[PDB]
Amino acid sequence: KGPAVGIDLGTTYSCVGVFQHGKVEIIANDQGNRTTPSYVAFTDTERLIGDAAKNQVAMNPTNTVFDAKRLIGRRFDDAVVQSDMKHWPFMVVNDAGRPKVQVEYKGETKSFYPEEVSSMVLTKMKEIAEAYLGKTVTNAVVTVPAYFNDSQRQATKDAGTIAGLNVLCIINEPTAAAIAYGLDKKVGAERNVLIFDLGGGTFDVSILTIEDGIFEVKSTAGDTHLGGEDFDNRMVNHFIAEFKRKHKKDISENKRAVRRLRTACERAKRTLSSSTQASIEIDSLYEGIDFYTSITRARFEELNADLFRGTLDPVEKALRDAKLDKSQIHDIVLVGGSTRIPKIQKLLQDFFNGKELNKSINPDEAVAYGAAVQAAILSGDKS
């Protein structure tokens, strides 16, 4: 029967892969993207998911939902939930001790549990793999951060069940990445692996010891509120001042213009990973005024200097909690979309004294890649 998939169900973007014909395919959505925003837009007519959801956020901020992974498996009165709520433009309420996302859908107020919201994203990733395979998808492996507990794991599984999936296993994101590189298929003495995962909202360092295919999380570190979104924000403020200088207008107070600027900054940011400058081009940004401008890689790097270099403290921290020296880790693996930033890679590599990084698998894809490998073995479709 039909193959099983791997789904990286991510805080900011999700990704799906299938292991078929001896190879893993990370599957593009219908807009051409190999990853998909973990975004759910509610409107008067439709429910939108992914690229279509994220693109209308500027117009529809209060009914566009993201960061559900931050609510999943948590109680309303969890200190993390209470602080996170400040950032979000959508509403969060208490149903009997459980967090609910409250939105306006089809001119009626509806509320959804975190695992329900994540089910919708999982559903979309399910559809992405079904469009590609030309057949229905049921079995999945889904990934979860190493530091997730049993409540968050169970709730992630339940989001699978709500999506129509039979979740074969819930596995750790760092572990899946190591599997993506086939590090668990090495023999001999125990190897130490370091996972450097910098995504859109979270930064994770994990150290694993692998021996005879068996993983052990030795230590974890990072910052659950540090990712690409923050580098975006540095550029956003950079240009808010620039628009104020050129035009004597301040856009800080206009939700729509600020978001529209973030979207251009994020696109610009990706360009800077492969090129040394990027142009920004927004029609009628504010009160009729076209914004056109340029930004160098150097300028991007220095706008983010502190955030980039502080990325190494969690490395050192995980390294001591693991009771290992820099020289003692055998594999470094780059995970997360923000690790495509050249200055982050030099920064990490120079910390390890020039040692080569595992980066050939697209970092924002390495998790789903490993989950797909695992789904296959779990189904008897690999070796």
Binding site: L168, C169, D212, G213, I214, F215, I377, L378, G380
Partner: protein
């Protein structure tokens, strides 16, 4: 040398991918501590329906997901793997 591994290695090769032979003797290679698996006799392994029924049961016991972080993790996967290949070979028959 790993004695619990050596016993599974020996079980695997002695039964020659006979799904029924493996299923009917799996209790002699499960880790000490395993409590769910009641031994099957050939008598409940005659029809393909029976063999299907029992293999799904065996696969649940030794499944690699449940066995993660367990002292018998490696052996569960050794068994699961051989079960899957025995079953695929059982299904090729015909």
């Amino acid at each position: 040398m790993d004695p619990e591994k050596l016993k599974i290695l020996e079980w695997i090769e002695g039964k020659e991918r006979n799904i029924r032979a493996l299923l009917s003797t799996m209790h002699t290679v499960l880790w000490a501590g395993e409590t769910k698996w009641k031994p099957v006799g050939m008598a409940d392994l005659v029809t393909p329906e029976q063999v299907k029924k029992v293999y799904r049961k065996a696969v649940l016991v030794v499944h690699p997901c449940k066995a993660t972080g367990q002292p018998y993790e490696q052996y569960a996967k050794m068994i699961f793997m051989e079960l899957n290949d025995a079953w695929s070979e059982f299904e090729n028959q015909g």
